[PDB]
Protein backbone atom coordinates (compact mmCIF):
# COMPACT_ATOMS: atom_id res chain seq x y z
CA UNK A 1 0.00 0.00 0.00
CA UNK A 2 2.83 2.41 0.76
CA UNK A 3 6.32 1.66 -0.60
CA UNK A 4 9.57 3.63 -0.93
CA UNK A 5 12.20 3.96 -3.65
CA UNK A 6 15.73 5.32 -3.17
CA UNK A 7 18.38 6.15 -5.85
CA UNK A 8 21.83 7.18 -4.55
CA UNK A 9 24.27 8.66 -7.04
CA UNK A 10 27.71 9.94 -6.18
CA UNK A 11 26.63 13.53 -6.63
CA UNK A 12 22.92 13.37 -5.80
CA UNK A 13 20.28 11.48 -3.76
CA UNK A 14 16.61 10.93 -4.84
CA UNK A 15 13.59 9.25 -3.30
CA UNK A 16 9.94 8.51 -3.95
CA UNK A 17 6.99 7.34 -1.86
CA UNK A 18 4.33 5.46 -3.76
CA UNK A 19 0.85 4.51 -2.64
CA UNK A 20 -0.58 1.31 -4.13
CA UNK A 21 2.00 1.38 -6.94
CA UNK A 22 -0.12 4.09 -8.56
CA UNK A 23 0.27 7.38 -6.71
CA UNK A 24 3.50 9.28 -6.17
CA UNK A 25 2.62 10.75 -2.81
CA UNK A 26 5.96 12.54 -2.38
CA UNK A 27 9.32 13.04 -4.08
CA UNK A 28 12.59 14.74 -3.27
CA UNK A 29 16.07 15.35 -4.72
CA UNK A 30 19.28 16.55 -3.04
CA UNK A 31 22.57 17.64 -4.65
CA UNK A 32 24.65 15.44 -2.28
CA UNK A 33 25.54 11.77 -2.79
CA UNK A 34 26.92 8.48 -1.39
CA UNK A 35 28.70 9.07 1.93
CA UNK A 36 27.03 12.36 2.82
CA UNK A 37 23.94 13.66 4.62
CA UNK A 38 22.20 13.74 1.24
CA UNK A 39 20.33 10.44 1.64
CA UNK A 40 19.30 11.27 5.24
CA UNK A 41 17.96 14.62 4.03
CA UNK A 42 15.92 12.86 1.36
CA UNK A 43 14.27 10.69 4.01
CA UNK A 44 13.41 13.64 6.29
CA UNK A 45 11.75 15.44 3.39
CA UNK A 46 9.79 12.34 2.51
CA UNK A 47 8.73 11.42 6.01
CA UNK A 48 7.97 15.01 6.91
CA UNK A 49 5.70 16.02 4.05
CA UNK A 50 3.87 12.71 4.35
CA UNK A 51 3.52 12.42 8.16
CA UNK A 52 4.03 8.63 7.84
CA UNK A 53 5.95 6.30 10.22
CA UNK A 54 8.62 3.76 9.39
CA UNK A 55 6.07 1.02 10.09
CA UNK A 56 3.92 2.36 7.23
CA UNK A 57 6.56 1.76 4.55
CA UNK A 58 6.30 -1.98 3.77
CA UNK A 59 9.38 -2.35 1.62
CA UNK A 60 12.27 -0.14 0.60
CA UNK A 61 14.35 -0.71 -2.52
CA UNK A 62 17.56 1.18 -3.27
CA UNK A 63 19.48 1.52 -6.52
CA UNK A 64 22.37 3.66 -7.82
CA UNK A 65 26.17 3.71 -7.78
CA UNK A 66 26.21 3.72 -3.95
CA UNK A 67 23.36 1.23 -3.38
CA UNK A 68 25.76 -1.22 -1.71
CA UNK A 69 26.54 1.36 0.97
CA UNK A 70 23.02 1.53 2.33
CA UNK A 71 21.75 -0.98 4.87
CA UNK A 72 18.22 -0.22 6.10
CA UNK A 73 16.72 -1.52 2.89
CA UNK A 74 14.82 -4.62 1.92
CA UNK A 75 16.60 -4.91 -1.47
CA UNK A 76 19.20 -3.55 -3.90
CA UNK A 77 18.29 -3.55 -7.59
CA UNK A 78 20.22 -2.34 -10.62
CA UNK A 79 19.86 1.19 -11.98
CA UNK A 80 19.37 -0.18 -15.46
CA UNK A 81 16.47 -2.33 -14.31
CA UNK A 82 15.05 0.39 -12.03
CA UNK A 83 15.41 3.31 -14.40
CA UNK A 84 13.54 1.53 -17.21
CA UNK A 85 10.82 0.46 -14.82
CA UNK A 86 10.15 4.12 -14.10
CA UNK A 87 10.18 5.13 -17.77
CA UNK A 88 7.26 2.75 -18.38
CA UNK A 89 5.47 4.40 -15.43
CA UNK A 90 5.74 7.58 -17.48
CA UNK A 91 4.82 6.03 -20.85
CA UNK A 92 2.62 2.97 -20.23
CA UNK A 93 2.82 -0.04 -22.58
CA UNK A 94 6.49 0.70 -23.26
CA UNK A 95 8.27 -2.45 -24.48
CA UNK A 96 11.37 -1.11 -26.24
CA UNK A 97 13.78 1.55 -25.00
CA UNK A 98 16.62 3.07 -27.03
CA UNK A 99 19.59 4.63 -25.17
CA UNK A 100 22.17 6.18 -27.44
CA UNK A 101 24.83 7.28 -24.98
CA UNK A 102 27.99 9.32 -25.34
CA UNK A 103 30.19 6.22 -25.67
CA UNK A 104 27.65 3.37 -25.94
CA UNK A 105 24.19 2.35 -27.19
CA UNK A 106 21.65 -0.03 -25.68
CA UNK A 107 18.29 -1.40 -26.71
CA UNK A 108 16.02 -2.79 -23.97
CA UNK A 109 13.00 -5.12 -24.30
CA UNK A 110 10.38 -4.93 -21.51
CA UNK A 111 7.60 -6.86 -19.77
CA UNK A 112 3.88 -6.24 -20.23
CA UNK A 113 4.53 -4.70 -16.77
CA UNK A 114 7.55 -2.58 -17.64
CA UNK A 115 10.11 -4.98 -16.23
CA UNK A 116 13.37 -5.55 -18.11
CA UNK A 117 13.44 -8.84 -20.05
CA UNK A 118 16.67 -8.76 -22.06
CA UNK A 119 18.87 -6.24 -23.83
CA UNK A 120 21.80 -5.51 -26.18
CA UNK A 121 24.69 -3.17 -25.52
CA UNK A 122 27.41 -1.80 -27.76
CA UNK A 123 30.41 -0.44 -25.81
CA UNK A 124 33.31 -1.51 -28.04
CA UNK A 125 32.61 0.36 -31.30
CA UNK A 126 32.60 4.16 -31.64
CA UNK A 127 30.21 4.05 -34.58
CA UNK A 128 26.51 4.10 -33.83
CA UNK A 129 27.19 6.02 -30.59
CA UNK A 130 27.57 9.50 -29.18
CA UNK A 131 31.24 9.94 -30.02
CA UNK A 132 30.54 9.32 -33.70
CA UNK A 133 28.72 12.66 -33.47
CA UNK A 134 31.49 14.54 -31.63
CA UNK A 135 33.96 13.65 -34.35
CA UNK A 136 31.94 14.72 -37.36
CA UNK A 137 30.93 17.94 -35.63
CA UNK A 138 34.49 19.04 -34.95
CA UNK A 139 35.36 18.46 -38.63
CA UNK A 140 32.71 20.83 -40.02
CA UNK A 141 33.38 23.16 -37.08
CA UNK A 142 29.91 23.12 -35.49
CA UNK A 143 28.45 22.52 -32.00
CA UNK A 144 26.79 19.12 -31.45
CA UNK A 145 23.49 20.48 -30.04
CA UNK A 146 23.16 22.86 -33.00
CA UNK A 147 23.07 19.71 -35.12
CA UNK A 148 19.49 18.42 -35.07
CA UNK A 149 18.09 21.67 -36.46
CA UNK A 150 20.52 22.13 -39.37
CA UNK A 151 19.29 18.76 -40.67
CA UNK A 152 15.64 19.95 -40.91
CA UNK A 153 16.03 21.67 -44.27
CA UNK A 154 17.67 18.76 -46.05
CA UNK A 155 17.03 18.79 -49.81
CA UNK A 156 19.16 15.95 -51.07
CA UNK A 157 21.10 13.61 -48.80
CA UNK A 158 24.81 12.86 -48.72
CA UNK A 159 24.93 9.06 -48.76
CA UNK A 160 27.82 7.48 -46.84
CA UNK A 161 29.47 4.10 -47.37
CA UNK A 162 31.96 3.96 -44.51
CA UNK A 163 30.52 2.35 -41.37
CA UNK A 164 33.69 2.72 -39.27
CA UNK A 165 34.16 6.06 -37.54
CA UNK A 166 37.69 6.74 -38.71
CA UNK A 167 37.10 5.87 -42.35
CA UNK A 168 33.95 8.02 -42.32
CA UNK A 169 35.88 10.95 -40.78
CA UNK A 170 37.70 11.17 -44.11
CA UNK A 171 34.59 10.60 -46.21
CA UNK A 172 32.92 13.76 -44.88
CA UNK A 173 36.04 15.85 -45.50
CA UNK A 174 35.81 14.61 -49.10
CA UNK A 175 32.17 15.75 -49.33
CA UNK A 176 33.16 18.94 -47.49
CA UNK A 177 35.98 19.67 -49.95
CA UNK A 178 33.51 19.55 -52.85
CA UNK A 179 31.36 21.90 -50.74
CA UNK A 180 27.93 20.23 -50.51
CA UNK A 181 25.01 21.64 -48.50
CA UNK A 182 25.45 20.91 -44.78
CA UNK A 183 21.79 19.90 -44.37
CA UNK A 184 22.52 17.12 -46.86
CA UNK A 185 25.66 16.01 -45.00
CA UNK A 186 24.22 16.19 -41.50
CA UNK A 187 21.27 14.18 -42.87
CA UNK A 188 23.67 11.40 -43.96
CA UNK A 189 25.58 11.32 -40.70
CA UNK A 190 22.32 10.94 -38.81
CA UNK A 191 21.54 8.12 -41.24
CA UNK A 192 24.83 6.44 -40.28
CA UNK A 193 24.16 6.18 -36.55
CA UNK A 194 20.52 5.36 -37.30
CA UNK A 195 21.54 2.44 -39.51
CA UNK A 196 23.93 1.21 -36.77
CA UNK A 197 21.58 1.13 -33.76
CA UNK A 198 18.86 -0.14 -36.12
CA UNK A 199 20.80 -3.39 -36.32
CA UNK A 200 20.74 -3.82 -32.54
CA UNK A 201 17.05 -2.98 -32.67
CA UNK A 202 16.57 -5.44 -35.49
CA UNK A 203 18.32 -8.22 -33.53
CA UNK A 204 16.40 -7.65 -30.32
CA UNK A 205 13.01 -7.18 -31.99
CA UNK A 206 10.80 -4.10 -32.14
CA UNK A 207 7.53 -3.99 -30.18
CA UNK A 208 5.74 -0.75 -29.33
CA UNK A 209 5.56 1.45 -27.57
CA UNK A 210 9.07 2.50 -28.57
CA UNK A 211 10.61 5.22 -26.39
CA UNK A 212 13.94 6.97 -26.97
CA UNK A 213 16.28 8.05 -24.17
CA UNK A 214 19.66 9.73 -23.66
CA UNK A 215 21.27 13.08 -24.38
CA UNK A 216 21.55 12.05 -28.00
CA UNK A 217 17.76 11.71 -28.11
CA UNK A 218 17.28 15.46 -28.18
CA UNK A 219 18.76 15.61 -31.64
CA UNK A 220 15.41 15.73 -33.43
CA UNK A 221 17.13 14.69 -36.67
CA UNK A 222 18.51 11.49 -35.18
CA UNK A 223 15.04 10.62 -33.98
CA UNK A 224 13.51 10.94 -37.48
CA UNK A 225 16.28 8.92 -39.11
CA UNK A 226 15.83 6.28 -36.42
CA UNK A 227 12.05 6.24 -37.03
CA UNK A 228 12.31 6.01 -40.81
CA UNK A 229 14.84 3.18 -40.34
CA UNK A 230 13.04 0.90 -37.84
CA UNK A 231 9.77 1.92 -39.52
CA UNK A 232 7.95 2.80 -36.31
CA UNK A 233 6.68 5.92 -34.51
CA UNK A 234 9.14 6.90 -31.76
CA UNK A 235 8.35 8.73 -28.53
CA UNK A 236 10.92 11.11 -27.11
CA UNK A 237 9.45 12.02 -23.69
CA UNK A 238 10.92 14.23 -21.00
CA UNK A 239 12.34 12.00 -18.26
CA UNK A 240 12.67 13.61 -14.77
CA UNK A 241 15.57 13.01 -12.43
CA UNK A 242 13.52 10.97 -9.98
CA UNK A 243 12.82 8.26 -12.57
CA UNK A 244 15.30 5.80 -11.07
CA UNK A 245 13.84 5.92 -7.53
CA UNK A 246 10.39 5.70 -9.07
CA UNK A 247 11.23 2.40 -10.73
CA UNK A 248 12.65 1.29 -7.39
CA UNK A 249 9.42 2.11 -5.54
CA UNK A 250 7.74 -0.03 -8.19
CA UNK A 251 10.02 -3.00 -7.56
CA UNK A 252 9.63 -2.34 -3.81
CA UNK A 253 5.95 -2.87 -4.56
CA UNK A 254 6.00 -6.17 -6.48
CA UNK A 255 7.81 -7.11 -3.27
CA UNK A 256 5.31 -5.92 -0.69
CA UNK A 257 2.77 -7.95 -2.67
CA UNK A 258 4.62 -11.24 -2.32
CA UNK A 259 4.89 -11.22 1.49
CA UNK A 260 1.15 -11.91 1.40
CA UNK B 1 58.02 -25.55 -71.67
CA UNK B 2 58.15 -21.79 -72.22
CA UNK B 3 55.35 -19.61 -70.82
CA UNK B 4 54.85 -15.87 -70.30
CA UNK B 5 53.40 -13.76 -67.49
CA UNK B 6 52.27 -10.12 -67.81
CA UNK B 7 51.19 -7.68 -65.02
CA UNK B 8 49.87 -4.28 -66.17
CA UNK B 9 49.45 -1.59 -63.55
CA UNK B 10 48.32 1.94 -64.25
CA UNK B 11 51.78 3.31 -63.64
CA UNK B 12 54.00 0.36 -64.57
CA UNK B 13 54.23 -2.77 -66.77
CA UNK B 14 56.05 -6.04 -65.82
CA UNK B 15 56.67 -9.36 -67.52
CA UNK B 16 58.35 -12.70 -67.01
CA UNK B 17 59.34 -15.62 -69.24
CA UNK B 18 59.48 -18.97 -67.51
CA UNK B 19 60.95 -22.22 -68.77
CA UNK B 20 59.30 -25.41 -67.48
CA UNK B 21 57.67 -23.50 -64.61
CA UNK B 22 61.06 -23.55 -62.91
CA UNK B 23 63.44 -21.10 -64.57
CA UNK B 24 62.92 -17.37 -64.92
CA UNK B 25 64.70 -16.96 -68.21
CA UNK B 26 64.03 -13.22 -68.47
CA UNK B 27 62.28 -10.37 -66.65
CA UNK B 28 61.58 -6.71 -67.29
CA UNK B 29 59.85 -3.70 -65.72
CA UNK B 30 58.82 -0.35 -67.25
CA UNK B 31 57.58 2.81 -65.49
CA UNK B 32 54.63 3.19 -67.93
CA UNK B 33 51.19 1.57 -67.59
CA UNK B 34 47.79 0.67 -69.13
CA UNK B 35 47.23 2.61 -72.37
CA UNK B 36 50.87 3.40 -73.12
CA UNK B 37 53.85 1.89 -74.93
CA UNK B 38 54.91 0.41 -71.59
CA UNK B 39 53.52 -3.09 -72.22
CA UNK B 40 54.90 -3.18 -75.79
CA UNK B 41 58.32 -2.21 -74.44
CA UNK B 42 58.15 -5.04 -71.93
CA UNK B 43 57.56 -7.54 -74.73
CA UNK B 44 60.45 -6.25 -76.86
CA UNK B 45 62.82 -6.58 -73.92
CA UNK B 46 61.61 -10.09 -73.26
CA UNK B 47 61.64 -11.30 -76.83
CA UNK B 48 64.94 -9.60 -77.55
CA UNK B 49 67.07 -10.91 -74.70
CA UNK B 50 65.64 -14.38 -75.23
CA UNK B 51 65.73 -14.64 -79.05
CA UNK B 52 62.44 -16.61 -78.93
CA UNK B 53 59.49 -16.43 -81.38
CA UNK B 54 55.81 -15.98 -80.62
CA UNK B 55 55.28 -19.63 -81.52
CA UNK B 56 57.60 -20.63 -78.66
CA UNK B 57 55.41 -19.08 -75.95
CA UNK B 58 52.64 -21.66 -75.38
CA UNK B 59 50.37 -19.61 -73.17
CA UNK B 60 50.27 -16.02 -71.96
CA UNK B 61 48.44 -14.92 -68.82
CA UNK B 62 47.90 -11.28 -67.88
CA UNK B 63 46.87 -9.74 -64.57
CA UNK B 64 46.71 -6.23 -63.09
CA UNK B 65 44.37 -3.22 -63.03
CA UNK B 66 44.46 -2.98 -66.85
CA UNK B 67 44.31 -6.72 -67.62
CA UNK B 68 40.94 -6.29 -69.36
CA UNK B 69 42.53 -3.93 -71.87
CA UNK B 70 44.90 -6.50 -73.32
CA UNK B 71 43.80 -8.92 -76.02
CA UNK B 72 46.63 -11.14 -77.30
CA UNK B 73 46.47 -13.29 -74.20
CA UNK B 74 45.21 -16.75 -73.45
CA UNK B 75 43.78 -15.73 -70.03
CA UNK B 76 43.16 -12.98 -67.47
CA UNK B 77 43.63 -13.88 -63.80
CA UNK B 78 43.29 -11.79 -60.67
CA UNK B 79 46.24 -9.94 -59.13
CA UNK B 80 45.38 -11.37 -55.74
CA UNK B 81 45.55 -14.91 -57.08
CA UNK B 82 48.62 -14.21 -59.25
CA UNK B 83 50.61 -12.22 -56.72
CA UNK B 84 50.31 -14.95 -54.06
CA UNK B 85 51.24 -17.61 -56.56
CA UNK B 86 54.53 -15.81 -57.10
CA UNK B 87 55.21 -15.36 -53.39
CA UNK B 88 55.16 -19.15 -52.99
CA UNK B 89 57.64 -19.36 -55.89
CA UNK B 90 59.90 -17.29 -53.67
CA UNK B 91 59.18 -19.15 -50.41
CA UNK B 92 58.18 -22.74 -51.24
CA UNK B 93 55.65 -24.58 -49.05
CA UNK B 94 53.91 -21.30 -48.25
CA UNK B 95 50.32 -21.93 -47.15
CA UNK B 96 49.37 -18.77 -45.24
CA UNK B 97 49.98 -15.17 -46.27
CA UNK B 98 49.34 -12.11 -44.10
CA UNK B 99 48.75 -8.72 -45.78
CA UNK B 100 48.30 -5.86 -43.38
CA UNK B 101 47.55 -2.97 -45.70
CA UNK B 102 47.17 0.75 -45.15
CA UNK B 103 43.36 0.52 -44.93
CA UNK B 104 42.72 -3.25 -44.88
CA UNK B 105 44.05 -6.66 -43.77
CA UNK B 106 43.82 -10.05 -45.47
CA UNK B 107 44.82 -13.57 -44.61
CA UNK B 108 45.22 -16.06 -47.48
CA UNK B 109 45.29 -19.89 -47.35
CA UNK B 110 47.13 -21.67 -50.19
CA UNK B 111 47.41 -24.95 -52.10
CA UNK B 112 50.21 -27.48 -51.71
CA UNK B 113 51.09 -25.83 -55.06
CA UNK B 114 50.84 -22.21 -54.00
CA UNK B 115 47.40 -21.62 -55.47
CA UNK B 116 44.87 -19.54 -53.54
CA UNK B 117 42.21 -21.64 -51.77
CA UNK B 118 40.20 -19.17 -49.68
CA UNK B 119 40.75 -15.98 -47.72
CA UNK B 120 39.43 -13.36 -45.27
CA UNK B 121 39.47 -9.61 -45.72
CA UNK B 122 38.79 -6.76 -43.34
CA UNK B 123 38.02 -3.47 -45.14
CA UNK B 124 35.32 -1.98 -42.90
CA UNK B 125 37.14 -1.54 -39.56
CA UNK B 126 40.09 0.80 -39.01
CA UNK B 127 41.42 -1.29 -36.15
CA UNK B 128 43.79 -4.11 -37.00
CA UNK B 129 44.96 -2.21 -40.11
CA UNK B 130 47.47 0.33 -41.32
CA UNK B 131 45.51 3.42 -40.36
CA UNK B 132 45.36 2.30 -36.74
CA UNK B 133 49.11 2.96 -36.84
CA UNK B 134 48.89 6.40 -38.50
CA UNK B 135 46.59 7.62 -35.77
CA UNK B 136 48.61 6.55 -32.76
CA UNK B 137 51.79 7.86 -34.34
CA UNK B 138 50.44 11.36 -34.86
CA UNK B 139 49.36 11.48 -31.21
CA UNK B 140 52.83 10.82 -29.76
CA UNK B 141 54.30 12.95 -32.55
CA UNK B 142 56.48 10.30 -34.23
CA UNK B 143 57.01 8.97 -37.78
CA UNK B 144 55.41 5.58 -38.56
CA UNK B 145 58.57 3.94 -39.98
CA UNK B 146 60.55 5.00 -36.90
CA UNK B 147 58.10 2.85 -34.95
CA UNK B 148 59.33 -0.74 -35.16
CA UNK B 149 62.71 0.11 -33.65
CA UNK B 150 61.47 2.14 -30.65
CA UNK B 151 59.57 -0.98 -29.56
CA UNK B 152 62.77 -3.10 -29.36
CA UNK B 153 63.79 -1.91 -25.90
CA UNK B 154 60.44 -2.54 -24.24
CA UNK B 155 60.77 -3.22 -20.50
CA UNK B 156 57.19 -3.40 -19.34
CA UNK B 157 54.21 -3.22 -21.68
CA UNK B 158 51.31 -0.78 -21.70
CA UNK B 159 48.27 -3.05 -21.86
CA UNK B 160 45.28 -1.68 -23.79
CA UNK B 161 41.60 -2.53 -23.40
CA UNK B 162 40.01 -0.51 -26.20
CA UNK B 163 39.73 -2.47 -29.45
CA UNK B 164 38.09 0.34 -31.45
CA UNK B 165 40.45 2.89 -32.98
CA UNK B 166 38.74 6.00 -31.69
CA UNK B 167 38.35 4.80 -28.12
CA UNK B 168 42.00 3.68 -28.11
CA UNK B 169 43.11 7.10 -29.44
CA UNK B 170 42.07 8.48 -26.06
CA UNK B 171 43.50 5.58 -24.08
CA UNK B 172 47.05 6.32 -25.28
CA UNK B 173 46.72 10.02 -24.47
CA UNK B 174 45.80 8.88 -20.95
CA UNK B 175 48.96 6.73 -20.75
CA UNK B 176 50.88 9.58 -22.39
CA UNK B 177 49.63 12.11 -19.82
CA UNK B 178 51.00 9.96 -17.00
CA UNK B 179 54.23 9.85 -19.03
CA UNK B 180 55.07 6.15 -19.44
CA UNK B 181 58.05 4.85 -21.45
CA UNK B 182 57.30 4.94 -25.19
CA UNK B 183 58.81 1.48 -25.74
CA UNK B 184 56.11 0.18 -23.39
CA UNK B 185 53.34 2.04 -25.23
CA UNK B 186 54.46 1.22 -28.74
CA UNK B 187 54.70 -2.41 -27.57
CA UNK B 188 51.01 -2.32 -26.56
CA UNK B 189 49.84 -0.71 -29.77
CA UNK B 190 51.62 -3.39 -31.76
CA UNK B 191 49.85 -5.89 -29.51
CA UNK B 192 46.51 -4.31 -30.47
CA UNK B 193 46.82 -4.80 -34.23
CA UNK B 194 48.43 -8.19 -33.62
CA UNK B 195 45.45 -9.33 -31.54
CA UNK B 196 43.08 -8.08 -34.28
CA UNK B 197 44.55 -9.80 -37.35
CA UNK B 198 45.20 -12.84 -35.13
CA UNK B 199 41.45 -13.37 -35.05
CA UNK B 200 41.25 -13.48 -38.85
CA UNK B 201 44.21 -15.84 -38.77
CA UNK B 202 42.51 -17.91 -36.10
CA UNK B 203 39.30 -18.16 -38.17
CA UNK B 204 41.03 -19.13 -41.39
CA UNK B 205 43.46 -21.57 -39.78
CA UNK B 206 47.24 -21.39 -39.53
CA UNK B 207 49.43 -23.77 -41.56
CA UNK B 208 53.09 -23.10 -42.28
CA UNK B 209 54.97 -21.78 -43.93
CA UNK B 210 53.57 -18.44 -42.78
CA UNK B 211 54.79 -15.43 -44.77
CA UNK B 212 54.06 -11.77 -44.01
CA UNK B 213 53.51 -9.12 -46.69
CA UNK B 214 52.73 -5.41 -47.02
CA UNK B 215 54.32 -2.10 -46.08
CA UNK B 216 53.25 -2.72 -42.51
CA UNK B 217 55.35 -5.90 -42.52
CA UNK B 218 58.57 -3.94 -42.26
CA UNK B 219 57.68 -2.88 -38.76
CA UNK B 220 59.81 -5.52 -37.06
CA UNK B 221 57.85 -4.99 -33.83
CA UNK B 222 54.52 -5.83 -35.45
CA UNK B 223 56.05 -9.01 -36.79
CA UNK B 224 57.16 -10.20 -33.32
CA UNK B 225 53.81 -9.38 -31.73
CA UNK B 226 52.10 -11.23 -34.56
CA UNK B 227 54.42 -14.24 -34.06
CA UNK B 228 53.97 -14.38 -30.29
CA UNK B 229 50.20 -14.15 -30.85
CA UNK B 230 49.61 -16.84 -33.51
CA UNK B 231 52.40 -18.84 -31.86
CA UNK B 232 54.31 -19.54 -35.07
CA UNK B 233 57.58 -18.49 -36.73
CA UNK B 234 56.88 -15.81 -39.36
CA UNK B 235 58.88 -15.12 -42.50
CA UNK B 236 59.17 -11.55 -43.73
CA UNK B 237 60.90 -11.95 -47.13
CA UNK B 238 61.77 -9.28 -49.66
CA UNK B 239 59.21 -9.42 -52.48
CA UNK B 240 60.35 -7.97 -55.87
CA UNK B 241 58.13 -5.95 -58.16
CA UNK B 242 57.88 -8.70 -60.77
CA UNK B 243 56.14 -11.07 -58.35
CA UNK B 244 52.71 -10.59 -59.91
CA UNK B 245 53.81 -11.46 -63.48
CA UNK B 246 55.75 -14.37 -62.04
CA UNK B 247 52.61 -15.86 -60.54
CA UNK B 248 50.94 -15.27 -63.90
CA UNK B 249 53.64 -17.18 -65.78
CA UNK B 250 52.95 -19.97 -63.29
CA UNK B 251 49.23 -20.00 -64.02
CA UNK B 252 50.08 -19.69 -67.74
CA UNK B 253 51.95 -22.93 -67.11
CA UNK B 254 49.29 -25.05 -65.37
CA UNK B 255 47.50 -24.06 -68.58
CA UNK B 256 50.07 -25.13 -71.15
CA UNK B 257 50.02 -28.47 -69.36
CA UNK B 258 46.30 -29.07 -69.83
CA UNK B 259 46.25 -28.64 -73.63
CA UNK B 260 48.04 -31.99 -73.68
S1 LIG C 1 34.64 0.03 -37.03
FE1 LIG C 1 36.55 -0.36 -35.79
FE2 LIG C 1 35.69 2.01 -36.55
S2 LIG C 1 37.85 1.51 -35.99
S1 LIG D 1 35.46 -0.47 -33.80
FE1 LIG D 1 36.37 1.60 -34.16
FE2 LIG D 1 33.99 0.84 -35.02
S2 LIG D 1 34.64 3.01 -34.68
Swiss-Prot record, chains A, B:
<protein>
    <recommendedName>
        <fullName>2-hydroxyisocaproyl-CoA dehydratase activator</fullName>
        <ecNumber>3.-.-.-</ecNumber>
    </recommendedName>
</protein>
<keyword id="KW-0479">Metal-binding</keyword>
<comment type="function">
    <text>Involved in the reductive branch of L-leucine fermentation. Required for the activation of (R)-2-hydroxyisocaproyl-CoA dehydratase. The reduced activator transfers one electron to the dehydratase concomitant with hydrolysis of ATP. This protein is extremely sensitive towards oxygen.</text>
</comment>
<dbReference type="GO" id="GO:0051539">
    <property type="term" value="F:4 iron, 4 sulfur cluster binding"/>
</dbReference>
<comment type="similarity">
    <text>Belongs to the HadI activator family.</text>
</comment>
<keyword id="KW-0411">Iron-sulfur</keyword>
<keyword id="KW-0067">ATP-binding</keyword>
<dbReference type="InterPro" id="IPR051805">
    <property type="entry name" value="Dehydratase_Activator_Redct"/>
</dbReference>
<keyword id="KW-0614">Plasmid</keyword>
<feature type="binding site">
    <location>
        <position position="125"/>
    </location>
    <ligand>
        <name>[4Fe-4S] cluster</name>
    </ligand>
</feature>
<feature type="binding site">
    <location>
        <position position="164"/>
    </location>
    <ligand>
        <name>[4Fe-4S] cluster</name>
    </ligand>
</feature>
<keyword id="KW-0378">Hydrolase</keyword>
<dbReference type="InterPro" id="IPR008275">
    <property type="entry name" value="CoA_E_activase_dom"/>
</dbReference>
<feature type="binding site">
    <location>
        <position position="134"/>
    </location>
    <ligand>
        <name>ATP</name>
    </ligand>
</feature>
<comment type="subunit">
    <text>Homodimer.</text>
</comment>
<dbReference type="GO" id="GO:0006551">
    <property type="term" value="P:L-leucine metabolic process"/>
</dbReference>
<dbReference type="GO" id="GO:0016787">
    <property type="term" value="F:hydrolase activity"/>
</dbReference>
<keyword id="KW-0408">Iron</keyword>
<feature type="binding site">
    <location>
        <position position="241"/>
    </location>
    <ligand>
        <name>ATP</name>
    </ligand>
</feature>
<feature type="binding site">
    <location>
        <position position="215"/>
    </location>
    <ligand>
        <name>ATP</name>
    </ligand>
</feature>
<dbReference type="InterPro" id="IPR002731">
    <property type="entry name" value="ATPase_BadF"/>
</dbReference>
<feature type="binding site">
    <location>
        <begin position="10"/>
        <end position="14"/>
    </location>
    <ligand>
        <name>ATP</name>
    </ligand>
</feature>
<dbReference type="Pfam" id="PF01869">
    <property type="entry name" value="BcrAD_BadFG"/>
</dbReference>
<dbReference type="GO" id="GO:0005524">
    <property type="term" value="F:ATP binding"/>
</dbReference>
<keyword id="KW-0547">Nucleotide-binding</keyword>
<dbReference type="GO" id="GO:0046872">
    <property type="term" value="F:metal ion binding"/>
</dbReference>
<feature type="binding site">
    <location>
        <begin position="102"/>
        <end position="104"/>
    </location>
    <ligand>
        <name>ATP</name>
    </ligand>
</feature>
<keyword id="KW-0004">4Fe-4S</keyword>
<dbReference type="InterPro" id="IPR043129">
    <property type="entry name" value="ATPase_NBD"/>
</dbReference>
Amino acid sequence: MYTMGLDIGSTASKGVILKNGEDIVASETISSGTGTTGPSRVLEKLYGKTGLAREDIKKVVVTGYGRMNYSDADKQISELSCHARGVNFIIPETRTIIDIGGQDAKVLKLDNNGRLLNFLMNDKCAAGTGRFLDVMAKIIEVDVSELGSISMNSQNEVSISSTCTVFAESEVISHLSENAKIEDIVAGIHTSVAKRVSSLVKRIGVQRNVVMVGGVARNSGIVRAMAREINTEIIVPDIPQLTGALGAALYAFDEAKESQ
